Amino acid sequence: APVLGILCGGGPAPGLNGVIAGATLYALRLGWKVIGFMEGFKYLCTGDVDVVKAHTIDLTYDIVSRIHFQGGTIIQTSRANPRKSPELQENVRKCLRALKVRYFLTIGGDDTASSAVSVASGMNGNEISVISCPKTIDNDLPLPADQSTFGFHTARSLGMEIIRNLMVDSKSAPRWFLVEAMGRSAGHLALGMAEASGAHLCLIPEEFKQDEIEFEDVVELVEATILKRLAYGKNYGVCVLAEGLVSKMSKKALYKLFGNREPPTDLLDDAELARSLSEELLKRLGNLGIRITPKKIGYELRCADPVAFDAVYTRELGYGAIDAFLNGHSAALIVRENGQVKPVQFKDLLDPATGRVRTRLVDVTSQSFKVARVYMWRMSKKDYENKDLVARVAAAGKMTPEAFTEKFAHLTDVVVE
Amino acid sequence: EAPVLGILCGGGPAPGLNGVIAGATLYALRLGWKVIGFMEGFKYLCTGDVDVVKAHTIDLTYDIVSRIHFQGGTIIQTSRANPRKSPELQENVRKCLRALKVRYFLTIGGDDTASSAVSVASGMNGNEISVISCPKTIDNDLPLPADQSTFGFHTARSLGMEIIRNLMVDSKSAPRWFLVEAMGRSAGHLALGMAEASGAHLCLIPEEFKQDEIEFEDVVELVEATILKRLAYGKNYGVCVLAEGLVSKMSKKALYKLFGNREPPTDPHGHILLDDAELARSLSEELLKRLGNLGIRITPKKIGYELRCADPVAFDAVYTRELGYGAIDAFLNGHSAALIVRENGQVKPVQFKDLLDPATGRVRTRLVDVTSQSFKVARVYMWRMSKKDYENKDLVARVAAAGKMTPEAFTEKFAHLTDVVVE
Amino acid sequence: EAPVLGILCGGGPAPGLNGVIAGATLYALRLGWKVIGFMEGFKYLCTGDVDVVKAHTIDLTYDIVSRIHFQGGTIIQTSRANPRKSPELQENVRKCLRALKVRYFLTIGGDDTASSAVSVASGMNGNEISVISCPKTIDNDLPLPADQSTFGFHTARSLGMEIIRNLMVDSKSAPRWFLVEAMGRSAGHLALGMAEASGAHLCLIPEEFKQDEIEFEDVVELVEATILKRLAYGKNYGVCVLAEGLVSKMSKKALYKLFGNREPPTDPHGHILLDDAELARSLSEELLKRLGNLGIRITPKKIGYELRCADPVAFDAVYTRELGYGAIDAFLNGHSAALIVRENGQVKPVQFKDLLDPATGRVRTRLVDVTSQSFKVARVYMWRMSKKDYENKDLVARVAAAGKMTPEAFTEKFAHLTDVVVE
Amino acid sequence: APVLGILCGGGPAPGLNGVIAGATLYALRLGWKVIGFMEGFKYLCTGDVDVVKAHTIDLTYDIVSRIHFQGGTIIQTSRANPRKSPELQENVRKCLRALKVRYFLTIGGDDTASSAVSVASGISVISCPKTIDNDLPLPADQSTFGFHTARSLGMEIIRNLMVDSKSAPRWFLVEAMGRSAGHLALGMAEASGAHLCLIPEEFKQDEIEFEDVVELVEATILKRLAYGKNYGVCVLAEGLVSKMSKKALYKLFGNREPPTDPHGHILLDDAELARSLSEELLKRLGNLGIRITPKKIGYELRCADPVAFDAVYTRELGYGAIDAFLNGHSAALIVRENGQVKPVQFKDLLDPATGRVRTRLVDVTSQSFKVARVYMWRMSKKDYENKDLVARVAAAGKMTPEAFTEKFAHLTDVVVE
């Protein structure tokens, strides 16, 4: 019987198990034998077939029949990337040939899909066929606008639930939370949690007009929101900050971010955007009775059990992977577009400037973004021109209307309106 | 003085109603509008008494609506009171809306509610009142672009998946079959959504039956063949999801059997009382007579009222926020007799007449498309006897033996089911 | 080689079973023991065929059990196969346990399961096998010190509260009364727990009735008085929780009305089939006849099977970890024919004789103590007509008016209920 | 009619609304008038009766009928502490007499109850035990309300981190909020089957050393590594920080002088215990294939909706508060023992040495703690004496058995065994 081998690469996203079971269950009805490599390419990279066999498992009906309820990956995952060396690619080729893998399904990001493509291009097209299923919780794939990636709905819904608790706590015991949403690729996740939870502010890198962000501008964008709320009698709130703001910050901004010290180097993961902003905002606003606390939302989302939307989603993706193999496809991506799962060649989706799959960011000109912005607390262009409002907000911050305008009015050219 | 926006809810609740109320109210308040909410839909506007209406309307203020986007239900309640059946009632609603000086009238409800709103408007000056309705249904039966859901549907489906998950674990731990009846007779979207998400072993919806009228025996035999096939692979347990809409497709003879070989009940005016039907219970009794001797136990379970007012999931919190906004946007843009709907990520008003089915005069009902790719995928992961399966003699012998019957007896009893449902 | 510990589950599942399996297994593995698990309780041990038993036993290894403390249900399944009724079966179980060289035998189940384990033990030498059972019940009906719960009860109560919350929001949003029937006829702990936690407007348990047999009319009237009193305060909706055990206290005449003025159903052996009763539905139909004219709609809802295999809450995860440990500790200390129970924060073995009720031969049933302060507190926050209320002429006039009847009629009809239930 | 005034003090806990609703509903059936002071003692401490009047609300039936489902507190809370000054204490009395409060119910932790009694020595005063830290001196085995909810949600969050730690091999250092005691950290850890839990109660000496904490985590990671597992979750009580010596705090803050408030007291809130330990352990263990990430669990627990156990608990506590008022009790705490709610005089609960409410910590000699410890991964005394085991672990850490013994064996005198 033909052998289908499955592995996962990259970080988990809710629904991985749904893709594994969707492919495996359908393949088993066709009489296929299904195996799963543990920890992605980690052990295939050694080329030692005994080591690979000690870290592969038989994906059977009993194993996969009920994993569609569970977050995580039953075959685990890794960022092992055989593409960096030609010897590693040939090790993976040597182990896949040894196992008689006819169909090769990888579930991972592009680094994972590219590894699959590298191993295949140096391999006869009649012995092995290779398909990758693109996974990302960041929702940054180039699908038709408003169409989500699998695992995103789960990550957003649980994030909404955590922020709900922080909104209740911020009101019950007046304080501001700066919630840093993990993920530096795009602003989909931070804005999704913020809009759903009715957070009072959301900052994403996509809304900044100039190419590089300055630390002072981020502090003042949050500062103006806190003062405006205070002008309406509210000394509390929640502001959600996409971690991707950090990767748009200038070199000088990163120097201030790390405590006016030299930034580490091989290192954006050591940055604490929400914490740094909290320290700065407390000096400026503490005298007004404001307390500010950072909170990170990230790792607890990756392996939450999938919500129904992602359970249906990943079942249809697993099916479509087997369907593509049957139709002779290879070097393709299983994606869902306009309700149809279909294979799409890797090159059809690449951005020529990057060599990586094209990244879809938040469209800050769309109506969805402007609607989210309407329900935020912030000072618009029109608001700065309203002298009754500007006087009340300035007074809340114990500064003159001229001082307030002098400091904050420029922010309308910092971010889209 | 400031224009008055009045809001009411009609029909049955769905998760996200409060989100539409908060989106409309908060945006309207930033425009300086005054916002009021009628309690229990058209119930008191139908009386024409302005004192009764005022005793059952409330001022929708910032503090009231600021944090209801987290909460299920309706803070202004709802009702099925329907003024469209009478011109005196329509004129009563007009008399009370004029009295309260409602400039913008937003109804959040089903088809009966939207039709009532337009009827009340056609006898009104287009410069004094403007009317917009927001379409609500957990049944997902609105004529929207395919695969795009109505608000509250995602919440109802996700909670339904979680409940069935408990029943799937319970069915395996203590071998048994559950016949889960999903509430809703309009369409099969909800039953099929929960089943596919939960990996249930079977789903039956009215849309998959070819003939115009379903027979009780056919439904019994579709479940029976599934139980036997699982039993042929050593599994004496499972979950089967049944859309309540199977009942409303059943023939006269099938309904007589459904109600216990009794005359089907009827209301004063002559409508058969399908709410009193107990589909899952009736089928369980029959399947237990046939299969209990094989070691099969079957139990019915209904999933319905606990879904309607669950707190909205994030998808519906965003959805209903954009709808509440879009209603205010439609008022500002001079629209009236329109329905706020979302299409390809864009909220826009769509005229009520544009959505009607010309043959019926009512809004067209979107059912499950059983020819689509999504339905064929759902069907692959179910346990069932397909056309090809009935031709596989090795399989038919294994299943027949599980049911303690000859292979010819099995083929004679169940094989006709391939002409009952689309394959 | 290493001592063999065999584990099986009997009876209906309860949240935390897996926690007991993992607590016992992990500790035993640190001791160097070999751990096996029989699938579906005594079902295959009853056959006596050792090949069949081996085909339905599994090696409980570290990797199998390391992360099952999060999961509801039981990974080794369960069954009600009861070898206690036959020694031919008991000796089959003995034959398979000797063949597998089970030194330590742990059963997690109800009274039938614990009794079966001891019967298999009384016919073996005390040196070759030691037997411990962990008593399981989601009904909280074990004779532990008062206010101390059985494992799985906290989870079932908390999930039941969550379901009723959705019904409380739905009952207010779309005015209606829900009759929530909590499944389980043993006791009233579960129904009262969900009701008190959720602030339900009424709860009826068999324990609060003074007389030995309940009458159908009295149950109807106790709910009816609550609906009328709420109606007198402008609320035409609510939730009432009914313990299913009301059915098992009903008189012969009461059961005749319950089943539709028919003879109660019966099994082949003549015993009555109370599972076919629909307590909430029958009361709903009757209450609709009496109160529908007042604007009341009433709907039944069952809460039962979705509770059994919910994932355990933290209280039950810690609880079942301590029980699994205490079973291994009891084996190590030479105990046998004992029950692992937790009392006053201490897990300890308790000999079978300490817990049996001599009248039954089965474990004693702990019911709700309706004289306790906890019950009086729960009763304070319900909507109901007390002794004092019937003597308050101002109140009786408003409630009577809500029911469109004279105060003389109301007192004459309902006043006797103060001798029906404890006050 | 008599006036019952209700306030909340301290940090929020799930079930606050349940006590407000139980007390208010029962009091209203008695014909009482019920008012709620906003933000605890914040405004009563000013002595300005005009300000207090602007921050009190009438607790009515429609307000409280359905808040037993809701986390947080509708009358908010604060840590305003009239106990620190006699001038403040008389301010609270002046405002309460002005409002003619006959019955005064405070709902709060140990800090709150001590404030309540100070106001009383000169109206009837009752306090209800609140704290997710479970650190009130209640009868043994009886929890404070809100503890069950905080622990159950904490278990659920850690479950997601456990699935993520195995799926994408890594160690999470979960910092559980609360420096008072170890109840919360040990509860979440035991329920979630976490691989290690460190609480201040298990340390023998009066002062913890930073190196000892690092090494307690290090030995657990190496032992797991000796059994083929390069991942896990370790739960750390924040109270480890408040036991650390002056030198341990210097290393904790980055070999900095610890921050301090204007009075000379150290600012432990600025400490990042889990983050600091992660940095140190990554330097030592990164080469072995170990990744370590810190995660804090705290503020998202405080205002979760109450679980059924806390809903019933706080319903009975609110009732018992009114019943104590009816029976003439004062300066008492409503507590539950053996299913009976009863008032317990405040003097019975004082620490003769401290004058403040006694703080109940984890009893590390109890059977519950010994069982929890059995299911952890750690090196006991007997384990350090097992030469076969010591060789296996030492090899996992790429060190000789002599090096391992010299570094780690002393830890048996650092923590109870």
Ligand SMILES: Nc1ncnc2c1ncn2[C@@H]1O[C@H](COP(=O)(O)O)[C@@H](O)[C@H]1O
């Ligand atoms: N930036 C903002 N975002 C959302 N709502 C706001 C904002 N500013 C004011 N509001 C609300 O808009 C309404 C109108 O404010 P005003 O024009 O000051 O009466 C009030 O209910 C405010 O709370």
Ligand SMILES: Nc1ncnc2c1ncn2[C@@H]1O[C@H](COP(=O)(O)O)[C@@H](O)[C@H]1O
């Ligand atoms: N109707 C069905 N739906 C889903 N899986 C099935 C169905 N029928 C058989 N299988 C599974 O498909 C695989 C192939 O079985 P076989 O037909 O014996 O080769 C086995 O794992 C079966 O349990």
Ligand SMILES: Nc1ncnc2c1ncn2[C@@H]1O[C@H](COP(=O)(O)O)[C@@H](O)[C@H]1O
């Ligand atoms: N049976 C009951 N259970 C709980 N609350 C009640 C009940 N009857 C009346 N109440 C409430 O108790 C308060 C006092 O009512 P009254 O005695 O009419 O002034 C009001 O808030 C009523 O709604």
Ligand SMILES: Nc1ncnc2c1ncn2[C@@H]1O[C@H](COP(=O)(O)O)[C@@H](O)[C@H]1O
């Ligand atoms: N510190 C520990 N805590 C819990 N389990 C352990 C610990 N150390 C070893 N184990 C497990 O206990 C069993 C006994 O291991 P061994 O003594 O090496 O045979 C194996 O399943 C180990 O994985």
Ligand SMILES: O=P(O)(O)OC[C@H]1O[C@@H](O)[C@H](O)[C@@H](O)[C@@H]1O
């Ligand atoms: O055989 P089991 O253990 O009952 O598993 C049921 C499985 O049966 C199939 O219908 C589905 O494809 C699976 O998703 C489902 O879980």
Ligand SMILES: O=P(O)(O)OC[C@H]1O[C@@H](O)[C@H](O)[C@@H](O)[C@@H]1O
């Ligand atoms: O060894 P794993 O796969 O990491 O499992 C983690 C286990 O580690 C142990 O500490 C516990 O006994 C288990 O309850 C826990 O789940």
Ligand SMILES: [Cl-]
């Ligand atoms: Cl075996």
Ligand SMILES: [Mg+2]
């Ligand atoms: Mg404290």
